[PDB]
């Protein structure tokens, strides 16, 4: 008997630009999930947003890629999008690329990260949700959490973690994945994941017992649509403690606001800014990219929490540095490396008299 934690998210429109989810659209999604919970389809849920991305966090006993859970999410998004359209919100139904649902949401526009697990003696988790970036934004943090002993001293001091972790790395262009184990294969790992537009960490497992420790949403709108229609805006679930990274080691991996692709027009690098729920909205230059972190405990399918992780003074300098770096990046205007590299600009309209 297992519990599945599913985070399914989508942009269904937003106020004043790609800025923030309107509360009336969340209330519409809530009605759908409330009904699903009453019917016993799901055991519990929490709805929120980061920027213009509406987040459905659900626990249930129906496994990964469950048609009914995914269809419940789809319906919640559709009801939210209808309210968005009635309110004349910008980009109403943005990420709902298909007219209809079948099978599951993957390839329809919504992003999904989910894990079916056996709840541990206690089951603390952190869920990270980002706006204005793509799934590869989690590569550097996951490398740090699970492989870098300067981030996660448990790797050095905690006998249960000494055996290390392995990474399922997806080549999103070719649709093939490889497993690489730390610390033995870290140089090979970094040779790949250092290119986050192509090679994305999708899951992480503990080596000793193959315990599933983290999952990342790997939907990429560029690759689904064949052109730029928005930033993917990814989510990740990380299990904590008991020989997995401590909450503090997971958070340590976000204390440095690294440059991630996306931001204005899906065409720029900007610093990932960890923020409180109230600050999870896109402003200057349609960002900077925003990261919301929520901590929960899962108990018999119940979601206890959330606690808003980055809403705390220990991240005030991280936010200040993100602001300073955003200004520095912006002084580059439309030049690389503030503007994206050509292989990723090729999905924008940029492509649209030379003499020998």
Task: Report the catalytic residues.
Answer: 11, 228, 231
Span 304-343, contacts to a copy of itself by CB under 8 A: 304-305, 307, 309-310, 312-317, 319-321, 323-328, 330-339, 341-343
Q: Is 203 in the site for Mg ion (CB under 5 A)?
A: no
Q: CB pairs under 8 A, 24+ apart, for 91-94?
A: 91/11, 91/13, 91/14, 91/18, 91/52, 91/230, 92/12, 92/13, 93/12, 93/13, 94/10, 94/11, 94/12, 94/13, 94/14, 94/52, 94/229, 94/230
Backbone breaks in the chain (C–N > 2.5 Å) follow which residues? Answer: 352
What's the closest the beta carbon of residue 269 comes to Mg ion, in angstroms? 16
Q: Which of 3, 48, 53, 116 binds Mg ion (CB under 5 A)?
A: 53
Secondary structure letter of residue 118 according to DSSP: -
Question: Residue 338, SS3?
Answer: coil
CA distance 55 to 40: 20
Which stretch, 43-51, 57-65, 97-105, 187-195, contacts a copy of itself (CB under 8 A)?
Answer: 187-195
Q: Which of 172, 282, 291, 292 binds a copy of itself (CB under 8 A)?
A: 282
Q: Is 67 in the site for a copy of itself (CB under 8 A)?
A: no
Which stretch of DSSP H or E encloses residue 326? helix 316-330
- Give the DSSP letter string of 231-259: ----EEEEE-STTS--HHHHHHTTSS--E
Q: Which of 65, 186, 211, 224 binds a copy of itself (CB under 8 A)?
A: 186
Per-residue contact string for residues 196-215; x = within reach of a copy of itself by CB under 8 A: xxx-----------------
Q: Is 262 in the site for Mg ion (CB under 5 A)?
A: no
Q: Is 134 in the site for Mg ion (CB under 5 A)?
A: no
Q: Which is nearer to a copy of itself, 68 or 265 (CB)?
A: 265
CB 185 within 8 Å of CB 167: no
Instruction: Identify any residues that bridge with 8 across adjacent strands, giving them in sequence order.
Output: 56, 112
Q: Is 219 in the site for Mg ion (CB under 5 A)?
A: no
What's the closest the beta carbon of residue 68 comes to a copy of itself, in angstroms? 25
Which stretch, 42-50, 68-76, 96-104, 296-304, contacts a copy of itself (CB under 8 A)?
Answer: 296-304
CB 35 within 8 Å of CB 116: no
Binding site for Mg ion (CB under 5 A): 11, 18, 51-53, 91, 94, 131, 230-231, 233
């Amino acid at each position: 008997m297992k519990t599945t934690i599913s985070v399914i998210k989508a942009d269904i429109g937003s106020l004043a630009g790609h800025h923030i989810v309107h509360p009336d659209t969340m209330a519409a999604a809530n009605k759908v999930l409330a009904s699903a919970k009453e019917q016993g389809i799901i055991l519990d849920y929490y709805i929120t947003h980061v920027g213009d991305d509406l987040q459905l966090i659900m626990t249930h006993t129906r496994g990964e890629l469950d048609t009914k859970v995914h269809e419940t999410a789809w319906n919640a998004f559709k009801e939210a999008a209808k309210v968005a359209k009635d309110l004349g919100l910008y980009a109403a139904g943005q990420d709902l690329l298909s007219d209809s649902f079948s099978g599951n949401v993957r390839g329809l526009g919504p992003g999904v990260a989910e894990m079916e697990i056996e709840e541990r003696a206690s089951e603390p988790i952190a869920i990270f949700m980002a706006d204005k970036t793509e799934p590869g934004a989690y590569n550097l943090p996951l490398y740090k959490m699970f492989a870098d002993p300067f981030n996660t001293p448990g790797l050095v001091i905690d006998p249960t973690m000494h055996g290390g972790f392995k990474f399922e790395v997806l080549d999103v262009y070719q649709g093939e994945a490889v497993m690489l184990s730390a610390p033995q294969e870290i140089y090979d790992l970094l040779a790949l994941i250092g290119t986050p537009a192509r090679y994305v960490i999708r899951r992480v497992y503990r080596n000793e017992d193959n315990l599933l420790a983290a999952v990342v949403s790997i939907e990429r709108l560029n690759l689904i649509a064949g052109k730029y229609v928005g930033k993917d805006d990814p989510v990740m679930i990380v299990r904590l403690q008991h020989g997995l990274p401590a909450l503090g080691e997971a958070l340590e991996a976000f204390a440095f606001p690294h440059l991630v692709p996306g931001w204005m027009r899906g065409s720029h690098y900007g610093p990932l800014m960890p923020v409180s729920q109230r600050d999870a909205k896109a402003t200057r230059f349609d960002g900077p990219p925003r990261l919301l972190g929520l901590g929960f405990n899962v108990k018999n399918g119940r979601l206890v929490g959330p606690t808003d992780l980055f809403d705390d003074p220990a991240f005030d300098e991280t936010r200040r540095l993100a602001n300073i770096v955003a200004d520095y990046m912006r002084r580059h205007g439309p030049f690389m490396p503030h503007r994206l590299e050509p292989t990723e600009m090729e999905y924008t309209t940029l492509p649209l008299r030379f003499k020998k």
